[PDB]
Amino acid sequence: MEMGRRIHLELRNRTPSDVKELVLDNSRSNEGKLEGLTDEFEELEFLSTINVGLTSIANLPKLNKLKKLELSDNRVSGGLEVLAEKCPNLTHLNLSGNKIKDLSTIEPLKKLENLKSLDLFNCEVTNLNDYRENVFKLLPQLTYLDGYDRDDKEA
Amino acid sequence: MTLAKIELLKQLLRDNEAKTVLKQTTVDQYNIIRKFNTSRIEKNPSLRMKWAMCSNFPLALTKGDMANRIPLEYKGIQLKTNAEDIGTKGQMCSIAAVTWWNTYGPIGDTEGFERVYESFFLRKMRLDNATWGRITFGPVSAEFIEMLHCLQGENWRQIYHPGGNKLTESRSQSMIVACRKIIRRSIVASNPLELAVEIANKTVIDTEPLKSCL
């Protein structure tokens, strides 16, 4: 199975601007990328990339309608500033299970202002003193986190 | 069957040793053999009392009219036991019994108690009449040793003065301290004048305003 097969199954061989969500899960990728998603995409709301072996974020269509994106179980470790230049309209961010070394990796999210929830589970950065407080004062725009900002609501 | 036990007892009585041991050894002595048979002494006194208190009747009890004054039961709670004990040669009482005595026990007369334990009362009186001073940190008398725990430390010193029957300047000794407190309340607050006068006008030494005493 490949990203192309998932794209064909979800789109069912139709125009790219017909679905506002994608499910790219359990898909092998060339050197850890997210190919199979052409830049021609114009409308997209939800994303899902799990067990894709994504190692970096360097290929992504420019978008202005996406609000949620899901990355998990990946060895990606690099600056995410490119998201601002690609789609500065993210509201739900999920990095659960990813591999991030230190706090500097999550710095480039400051320039994004629409993010309200960020998820980081069993991450090497999560095991630090005052990581919760340090992240909060580092990303003032954030309104939610792993789930315990002040209360518990569901996405 | 009663008859079977009776015949067995008669057969046992036929033998001299069994008859002797049954005639001499008491029911109280019967418990003793089982104890050493399957029990022994323990250690760690702190935990020992912890275990003992949870038991039913851990406290020894004296024999007398007062001992029998307290009841056997109280609101569904046992207090003591009727049968005699072996060790103490008397009754045994539960912990709750003590509390019962503190609640509904006979009210004795405590007149002259201070005289008997006069030293402790003198110590308490000396402590009460203390005039604590300042506390000074590192540089970088019979009545004084008793309080040494609160006077001198490794890197601090507490200025403390003794007391004892210094009565006569009562009213004065009152007003000063009261006045002092007023200042302590006013200096911290902004514009101490109005607050100080307000507190001074609304203070009474137990019958009269501070102004009259001053």
Binding site: D102, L103, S104, N122, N127, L128, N129, D130, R132, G147, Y148, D152, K153, E154, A155 | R40, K43, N44, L47, K50, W51, A130, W132, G133, R134, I135, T136, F137, G138, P139, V140, C150, E154, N155, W156, Q158, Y160
Partner: protein, 425 residues
């Protein structure tokens, strides 16, 4: 967690209610093994855990195991050698003394840093409720009360305090169970009583543990106990952190509508009555940390002539809130409030007590001399050493396998490097 009004109940009933609330975990019968110990048998441990939960969920007041089969065969209690008369051993030629299993040598463990980092954080719950004291009159009493107020406020919710309370409570229960039951297996839940900011109090259950028999009446005799503790961390992430644990996967909890797995770390262990007493006394870390903080404050006040408590905590007009160098961030020094320093001190004391063995105490005793010499160097006192390599050998003789000792050596090296690089200014 199982919110309760605040009444005191027997541990068995508390465990029963906690399992009832999380019924799915209790009714788990098919274990999804995730990791295994080198020697322990997963089947025996799982059957023992099933027996423990069955006993907890029953109705009898006693917490005594009735299926002694798996308990006996799981802790290796039947594999003990049989003692024979000395004469046969003298006559026998195959009976020879065995060599001592000297501790292995291990490198730096990355999980101790995470332990120290996390145990010093402030959680949402506190587990300390101490009684009251008489009114304070003397100035020394006021100073002490202020110090106590600041200390408790700073470390009330610290996770280290909750862990310490769990440790002391579990050891107290273990010691109590050894009162009259010595030849029988006893099931003991690892419970805790906790209170949150809102005031509502919870009764947490951290797992179970079955304690075996100690036929010998000696107090320094190991009584094997096997403990099954719940956790939410997948051991595969740090394979080297758990070479001694047998872990299953029981079920999944939901906190914010999201599924998080639950593993059951099962481990065999051996401890004696004196170790129970040591665990019970492990509450002395509170007094130890308070004494350390009070020594710091006393030194600060001795520089001056007046107390420095509020000034060094909150700061007065003349002074500023004292700040302490806490740790490192991306290789750079980081400062923090006195509260963080107090929390780190408390966590360090708790870890020292928990990870205590002869190696740790020896290493501390010799690092005392090394630290004193470093201090003399700092104050330009011109220290002289007669046999430096003797001190270094004495210190290194104790760094074999203790996680705390190894991490302390690592931190000492880092701090020594920092002092060297900072003394040239």
């Amino acid at each position: 967690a199982n919110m309760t009004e605040g009444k005191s109940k027997k541990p068995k009933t508390l465990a029963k209610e906690c399992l009832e609330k999380y019924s799915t975990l209790r009714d788990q019968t098919d274990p999804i093994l995730i990791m295994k110990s080198e020697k322990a048998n997963e089947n025996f441990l799982w059957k023992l855990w099933r027996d423990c939960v069955n006993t907890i969920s029953n109705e009898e007041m006693s917490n005594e195991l009735q299926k002694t089969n798996y308990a006996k065969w799981a802790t290796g209690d039947g594999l003990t050698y049989q003692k024979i008369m000395k004469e046969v051993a003298i006559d026998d030629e195959t009976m020879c003394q065995e060599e001592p299993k000297i501790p292995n040598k291990c490198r730096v463990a990355a999980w101790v840093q995470t332990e120290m980092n996390l145990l010093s954080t402030l959680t949402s719950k506190r587990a300390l409720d101490l009684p009251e004291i008489g009114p304070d009159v003397a100035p020394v009493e006021h100073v002490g009360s202020e110090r106590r107020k600041y200390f408790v406020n700073e470390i009330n919710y610290c996770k280290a305090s909750t862990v310490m309370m769990k440790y002391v409570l579990f050891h107290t229960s273990l010691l109590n169970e050894s009162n009259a039951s010595m030849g029988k297996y006893k099931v003991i839940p690892i419970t805790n009583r906790v209170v949150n900011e809102k005031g509502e109090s919870f009764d947490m259950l951290y797992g179970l543990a079955v304690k075996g028999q100690s036929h010998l009446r000696g107090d320094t005799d190991v009584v094997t106990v096997v403990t099954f503790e719940f956790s939410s961390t997948d051991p595969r992430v740090d394979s080297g952190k758990w070479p001694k644990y047998t872990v299953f996967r029981i079920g999944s909890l939901f906190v914010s509508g999201r599924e998080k797995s639950v593993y059951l770390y099962c481990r065999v262990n051996g401890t004696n009555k004196i170790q129970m007493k040591w665990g019970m006394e492990a509450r002395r870390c509170l007094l130890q940390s308070m004494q350390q903080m009070e020594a710091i404050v006393e030194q600060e006040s001795s520089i001056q002539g007046y107390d420095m408590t509020k000034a060094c905590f909150k700061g007065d007009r003349v002074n500023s809130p004292k700040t302490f160098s806490i740790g490192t961030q991306e290789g750079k020094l980081v400062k923090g409030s006195f509260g963080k320093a107090l929390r780190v001190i408390f966590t360090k004391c708790l870890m020292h007590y928990v990870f205590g063995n002869a190696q740790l105490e020896g290493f501390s005793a010799e690092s005392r001399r090394l630290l004193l010499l470093i201090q003399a160097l700092k104050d330009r006192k011109g220290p002289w050493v007669f046999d430096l390599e003797g001190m270094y050998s004495g210190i290194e003789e104790c760094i074999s396998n203790n996680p705390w000792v190894i991490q302390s050596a690592y931190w000492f090296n880092e701090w020594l490097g920092f002092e060297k690089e900072g003394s040239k200014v």
